[PDB]
């Protein structure tokens, strides 16, 4: 889209938001949970998408 | 709050929405999954809260 932050009034970093639709965290249930490490929650929770 | 559906303009059944904040599926992860049955998805998916 040719969008570079802070290039224009509408592309200022304080005027950009992100919405994502997710309904599963299978990674946490199955793959990441076979060994819980320091990045379990940051890397598995849907909040971080 | 004394909210009876359909008894006033602002409480008509089609004018009421539900918003919920959830961030876990522990039942699905551990308890409901020990024996998957007919109500696994309807009973463990956050969409049904």
């Amino acid at each position: 889209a040719g969008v570079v932050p802070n290039r224009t009034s509408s592309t200022q970093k304080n005027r950009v938001g992100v919405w994502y639709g997710a309904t599963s965290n299978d990674w946490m249930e199955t793959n990441s949970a076979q060994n819980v490490d320091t990045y379990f929650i940051p890397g598995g929770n849907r909040a971080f998408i | 709050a004394g909210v009876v559906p359909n008894r006033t303009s602002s409480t008509q059944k089609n004018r009421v929405g539900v918003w919920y904040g959830a961030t876990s599926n522990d039942w699905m992860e551990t308890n409901s999954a020990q024996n998957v049955d007919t109500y696994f998805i309807p009973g463990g998916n956050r969409a049904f809260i």
Partner: peptide
């Protein structure tokens, strides 16, 4: 005017945590 140029040439690599030993079929057994 903005053209449709080729996407970034990412240096992709495989990062996977394989699900092993079929433990999902024994959820509750000793």
């Amino acid at each position: 005017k903005v053209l449709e140029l080729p996407a970034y040439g990412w240096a992709l690599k495989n990062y996977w945590l394989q699900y092993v030993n079929d433990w999902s079929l024994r959820k509750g057994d000793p």
